[PDB]
Design a protein around this ligand. Sequence first.
Ligand SMILES: *[C@@H]1O[C@H](CO)[C@@H](O[C@@H]2O[C@H](CO)[C@@H](O[C@@H]3O[C@H](CO[C@H]4O[C@H](CO)[C@@H](O)[C@H](O)[C@@H]4O)[C@@H](O)[C@H](O[C@H]4O[C@H](CO)[C@@H](O)[C@H](O)[C@@H]4O)[C@@H]3O)[C@H](O)[C@H]2NC(C)=O)[C@H](O)[C@H]1NC(C)=O
Ligand SMILES: *[C@@H]1O[C@H](CO)[C@@H](O[C@@H]2O[C@H](CO)[C@@H](O[C@@H]3O[C@H](CO)[C@@H](O)[C@H](O[C@H]4O[C@H](CO)[C@@H](O)[C@H](O)[C@@H]4O)[C@@H]3O)[C@H](O)[C@H]2NC(C)=O)[C@H](O)[C@H]1NC(C)=O
Ligand SMILES: *[C@@H]1O[C@H](CO)[C@@H](O[C@@H]2O[C@H](CO)[C@@H](O)[C@H](O)[C@H]2NC(C)=O)[C@H](O)[C@H]1NC(C)=O
Ligand SMILES: CC(C)CCC[C@@H](C)[C@H]1CC[C@H]2[C@@H]3CC=C4C[C@@H](O)CC[C@]4(C)[C@H]3CC[C@]12C
Ligand SMILES: *[C@@H]1O[C@H](CO)[C@@H](O)[C@H](O)[C@H]1NC(C)=O
Ligand SMILES: *[C@@H]1O[C@H](CO)[C@@H](O)[C@H](O)[C@H]1NC(C)=O
Lengths: 290, 216, 216, 246, 219, 285
Amino acid sequence: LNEEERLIRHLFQEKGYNKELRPVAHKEESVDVALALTLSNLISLKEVEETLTTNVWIEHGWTDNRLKWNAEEFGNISVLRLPPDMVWLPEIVLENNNDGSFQISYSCNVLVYHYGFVYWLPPAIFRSSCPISVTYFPFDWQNCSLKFSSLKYTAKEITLSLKQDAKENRTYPVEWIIIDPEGFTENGEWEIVHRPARVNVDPRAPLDSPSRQDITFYLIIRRKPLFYIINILVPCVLISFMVNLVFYLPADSGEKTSVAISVLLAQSVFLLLISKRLPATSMAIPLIGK
Amino acid sequence: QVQLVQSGAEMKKPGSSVKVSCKASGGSFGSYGIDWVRQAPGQGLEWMGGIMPKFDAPKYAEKFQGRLTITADRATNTAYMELSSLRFEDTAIYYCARDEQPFYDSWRGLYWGQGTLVTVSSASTKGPSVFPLAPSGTAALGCLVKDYFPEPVTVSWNSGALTSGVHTFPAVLQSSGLYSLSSVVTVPSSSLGTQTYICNVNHKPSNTKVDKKVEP
Amino acid sequence: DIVMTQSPLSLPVTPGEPASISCRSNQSLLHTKGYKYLNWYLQRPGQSPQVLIYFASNRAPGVPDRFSGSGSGTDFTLKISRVEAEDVGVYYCMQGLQIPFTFGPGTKVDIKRTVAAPSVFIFPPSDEQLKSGTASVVCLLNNFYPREAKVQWKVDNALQSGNSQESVTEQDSKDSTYSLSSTLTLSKADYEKHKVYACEVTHQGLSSPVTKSFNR
Amino acid sequence: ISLKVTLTNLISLNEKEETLTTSVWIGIDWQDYRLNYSKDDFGGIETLRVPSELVWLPEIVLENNIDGQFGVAYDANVLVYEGGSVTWLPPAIYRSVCAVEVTYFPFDWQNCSLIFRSQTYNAEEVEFTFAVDNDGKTINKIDIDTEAYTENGEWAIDFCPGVIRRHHGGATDGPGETDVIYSLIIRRKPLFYVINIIVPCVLISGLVLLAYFLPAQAGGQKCTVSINVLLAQTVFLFLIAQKIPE
Amino acid sequence: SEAEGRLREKLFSGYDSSVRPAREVGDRVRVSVGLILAQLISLNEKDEEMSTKVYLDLEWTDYRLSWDPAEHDGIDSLRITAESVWLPDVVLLNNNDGNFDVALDISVVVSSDGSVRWQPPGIYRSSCSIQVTYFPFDWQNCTMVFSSYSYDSSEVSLQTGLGGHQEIHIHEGTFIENGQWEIIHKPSRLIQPPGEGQRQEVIFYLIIRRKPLFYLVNV
Amino acid sequence: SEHETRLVAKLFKDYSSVVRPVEDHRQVVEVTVGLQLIQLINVDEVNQIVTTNVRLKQQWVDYNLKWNPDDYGGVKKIHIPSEKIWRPDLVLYNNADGDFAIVKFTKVLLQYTGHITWTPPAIFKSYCEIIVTHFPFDEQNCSMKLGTWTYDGSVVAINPESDQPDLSNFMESGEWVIKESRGWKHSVTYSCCPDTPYLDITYHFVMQRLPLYFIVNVIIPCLLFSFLTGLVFYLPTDSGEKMTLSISVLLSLTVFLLVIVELIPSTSSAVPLIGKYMLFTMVFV
Ligand SMILES: *[C@@H]1O[C@H](CO)[C@@H](O[C@@H]2O[C@H](CO)[C@@H](O[C@@H]3O[C@H](CO[C@H]4O[C@H](CO)[C@@H](O)[C@H](O)[C@@H]4O)[C@@H](O)[C@H](O[C@H]4O[C@H](CO)[C@@H](O)[C@H](O)[C@@H]4O)[C@@H]3O)[C@H](O)[C@H]2NC(C)=O)[C@H](O)[C@H]1NC(C)=O
Ligand SMILES: *[C@@H]1O[C@H](CO)[C@@H](O[C@@H]2O[C@H](CO)[C@@H](O[C@@H]3O[C@H](CO)[C@@H](O)[C@H](O[C@H]4O[C@H](CO)[C@@H](O)[C@H](O)[C@@H]4O)[C@@H]3O)[C@H](O)[C@H]2NC(C)=O)[C@H](O)[C@H]1NC(C)=O
Ligand SMILES: *[C@@H]1O[C@H](CO)[C@@H](O[C@@H]2O[C@H](CO)[C@@H](O)[C@H](O)[C@H]2NC(C)=O)[C@H](O)[C@H]1NC(C)=O
Ligand SMILES: CC(C)CCC[C@@H](C)[C@H]1CC[C@H]2[C@@H]3CC=C4C[C@@H](O)CC[C@]4(C)[C@H]3CC[C@]12C
Ligand SMILES: *[C@@H]1O[C@H](CO)[C@@H](O)[C@H](O)[C@H]1NC(C)=O
Ligand SMILES: *[C@@H]1O[C@H](CO)[C@@H](O)[C@H](O)[C@H]1NC(C)=O
């Protein structure tokens, strides 16, 4: 790589690139950071812990004019793979995590093109807070979210936007979580209904606050209730309906209250079974609990 | 000190197959960056085929398609070619050109082997017939070494004592499939009557040993 | 296929001075990324081919500083700042853009020396060879430069065609000359039918063609 | 490399995960001619403590760990004695694979292996020998200090031989490999299962024999007893499902 | 920015981030301690620990990090990595899992007058002695004791953060409300040493009441 | 020892680990990827995760890390920390919730020819579509997709070391038997960038569950309850024990539901066969 090693010396050693400074001509400007989220797989939703675990690939896009070069001068090299610790990064974190894992998991290489665009697709395992609505369990749907923002930089320093795609030379924003139809394996219990993406700006907060801006990726997910149906509802409902046979039993059999109290015991066992599977929230009584 | 060592020379019959290996030492080579180039006798270089990263499979010239199989083994640091349905014009020196780190789209030969001579002929081991080229102030005389197979033939004059002005020509392959060459020496015309001139012809495959006195 | 042509067919080179060789393509050799996929190869006498320049301006590792190259799409030039006596051989330009990859005809290089005319000697077939039923007539051209030379056979002043073969030695390492042999092969019956046999040579060191002949 | 492995505690054998947790410290001794010095030239110093990161180490790891932890727990100082002798005695917590032979559980014994090797060097580059005590006999086993050792509440260590293996030394195999394997033969103490599960289960399961002595009338409750013993056995099945290997 | 780089080079020439800022010997560094409760994750009764997600709110002055904006292209503030400046070693003393520190160091905001504001995120597991008598119809008193681990009261002085609001700040719009616990009170107090090695403490109290509908339905 | 010290000092005087180690930037780095499976730690049917202990053998050539052994006392190979050199960034593309890339940076074996062998350990947690239709007699085909995260095929080429994964040092599994294993290379080209293929090597493992645990613990009690269901119809009515028997069988099945739900996969892709049998027994009692 006479060429790739001559280019990196030119960019980083000769010109004195400083990864601490933002890529802006003056401090008053903000760096435009375009974000998109690809859902590799929905790992789980722990109802008791109220935690959503996801495997997501976060596409970052921003311009760094200090990392521009004339391709023809350097053997027509058009793109460079560099470590992420060698360049300025727009440190985006998952704000609404519930385990302290704010940052991406694997800090992969950045891709830097000759016209200054910095591409970066670090994959991450995240564990986010998803408050659970137990009202219609096991026929329930949940509304989880993945809120992304920067704590080291505010809206004064970076502007968060959605990634822009093209079709027939017409630009549109990517306002949804990207899912590869071929590579995506559906979760065994949760079906994705909606998966929007939004840029949220709070007019009340000051511009120099980390809470001014965020990009939130939502997951409206519907439970697939076949397991709970087959294993709880049909046995429990049939056993409960079985109490009505005592009225048709003759009083001379001497086995009436035994049948009824045994049905009560079976219902208590089912209650014990259900008590392990949901959190002890007071917002509502679950449907199965009702 | 990277060195490519090919297999030894081959004598083949028409319609047979020849497999030529190309083994490397002193360097680490992969599954790509292999190209085979042959030079027919008296002709220029000709590309046959090779494996490049872009195709991830060997590609061959139209002439050799259906007959050539080029393979490279990264584990053993060896590359192979196998040319089947051998024809008379497949007689050539076959070279392997290789790179340790392949170019994606094309190839360069930074390391070559010594070449493997493959001879495709239905001829049989035949010794030469040695005839004099009698001398008609310098005069010349020579020996016509005709109709032998296979190469080579060694010619010396006066048991190696005469080495000034001796020209032993490269052999020419005739349409009969047998080789022929001439060896000539220029001498003073005054020495034709006083000095004896004998050409010593040797053809090891036939054990032909001829000492032909050349005189007017 | 891309057709590659080189000029000059032969370049004579005075050890100590620069030299230049040119290649041509009937198609643009420019890659989509602006890389001109042309390679230059040298084959020294009795040696395997060796790369000198790759991608039309890049010197391969180990090649000395003397060699350099340049070009544009279809026209390419290989230059030697100073010519040393180790740089003698056939230089090949090759296109590596489109399969089949093709070498050029090849430009031969040889050490320059003053013009030297051949000494023309003709030899009859021997009685020993005529005993076997064939007749070979050998015309020789000794110690001439340059290698360009034409040999025409005449039998009773009738030009022959298709019944002769030529062999040439490599340039002599001391006096820097070539030597050439042309051999007519005729059957004994055809040999006896005609009287006069003659080989006529033409060479730039000769003021006019030189004929050597005999009468049986 | 002179190797000794000392076991301080056997923490647990997790049947569900098939994991043995042990607390050990490895005795590692070797020669380094570059770190050779005489006490007379340095004021009588016979020992020098330096961080282990400053000296070459053979990089001994537990190959058969299950949790991905190959190295030692605490990088202690190496002791550099005069004459080029280097001693490193780091402690370690290891979670090792132990396939649980379930057949006679809970009256079972296990054969848990601790396999040690160099992570970097082959047998021609680094080799192992067992350490020797002051009496000179080779310590080809796990060393346990009797005074400080508290037996595991459930597991008794009966045997612990050590063997230095060498293999892949053939021409086709190429460079030879070596490792040290210690075979912890451990016996379970089945008292908890006897008192809490087996004896109650045996008595409750023997109760069905009493059904043969009850009258065969309406008030006999012969089927009451039998089927309720089956129900109690189902409860014991739920109890046992939490303990057995899977 | 080139001007920002020049200002950073001017500021951090001869600057030691391990040395407490004190122009004269005996000068105290005043640190204002606040707390923002992002989420009340849980209160584990078996382990007797409260899990919270919080943003600390630490403010202090470092005289070494002062500059004139007029001489530096009107730059009135800087965002600097926390590890590059001196920090007060303020930690959760009553942590239950052995973790004293913040979840992410992030960046401080330095004003031209030397004022330093730091708002690191934190996931904390604090020890809470559970009053079990009225469980599940109970209320708990779970505290988060914050203090400097090393510096004594003669070196770093603590005060409750404000900007007379001595409370944990809960942003009503973005607060993740807990489904089992209702927050009744959320004060903050500065605790002086009794009567050197003496250290002040800023304690944030969370008096939370359980919502017992689950146990009413199921027990 | 001094020869190796001098060699290592010479090699890394002006070395760069960020750039691909090729003489020319137009050359391709060939990486030979070989997966050695050490242990199948666990298969998670609920979250569809297969966790395995593996060795990811990687072999490439660094053009700049070459030396003549005659110039360094005959040293033909050395051991170098992996962090100091350029490496390929292989990532488990179908990672479920574990590490995406290698985290254990062991030393590499560097030959004088520039050939690097790196065999780091890893614990792969890979997503694996579990088909529970025939559970516990089910057969599962889970793979591990591996490829360079940030390098396309035109700069870094990958090829399997062997047609199959290396199972020579595979520890026996007490729950699964590997019927078949095979590694396949795949190349994907998109119309937007026809000259930049994207490569991956996918190792797949066909695994058959050992069902003895579920036969003993789940199926046999269900069969016993199913048999006990029919015996009530041979009881006399005057015994006053028919309801006792039937209701006690129902209660035994209800208690057994705890065992089954803790054992059965809690997924809704399909009804497990054990689930079908238990529903059969419950409905018919
Ligand atoms: C578990 O799941 C995995 C993944 O889905 C399955 O793996 C697939 O297995 C099949 C074999 O049954 C693989 O198909 C084979 O791929 C080979 C790839 O060859 C290379 O070269 C070609 C170019 O020539 C490239 O296009 C290709 O990408 C490779 O680089 C083929 O050579 C095989 O050819 C066979 O089929 C053709 C007809 O299609 C015949 O003409 C051939 O003679 C030959 O029989 C074949 O196509 C497939 O690639 C694997 N996929 C993956 C993702 O790895 C497992 O099989 C599955 N296990 C089970 C269910 O048992
Ligand atoms: C606890 O575990 C250890 C480690 O597994 C175990 O020690 C090993 O025992 C096996 C046998 O169980 C030993 O295998 C032996 O190897 C010798 C040569 O070294 C062979 O002669 C014998 O192998 C025979 O069978 C092979 C397969 O059928 C054939 O290939 C071979 O030709 C022979 O017929 C032989 O039994 C092994 O060497 C040791 N290794 C160690 C680490 O010591 C130990 O026995 C276990 N302790 C118990 C169960 O009490
Ligand atoms: C340098 O390389 C770039 C990238 O390959 C060349 O731009 C391409 O040119 C081809 C035509 O030859 C177009 O079809 C592609 O769409 C271009 N790619 C892009 C991404 O723009 C460029 O032409 C080369 N420059 C020179 C002077 O050769
Ligand atoms: C009263 C006695 C005879 C028992 C009767 C059992 C009946 C009511 C049970 C047994 C199996 C049950 C079915 C099992 C699974 C499914 C698929 C899903 O879409 C839920 C409904 C459905 C279709 C159930 C409907 C009710 C069902 C048919
Ligand atoms: C050049 O000539 C050859 C031979 O006639 C032909 O195959 C080729 O297509 C020509 N190239 C162009 C670009 O015309
Ligand atoms: C260390 O050096 C002394 C000489 O100073 C020598 O006597 C001793 O044997 C050496 N020790 C080693 C390396 O064995």
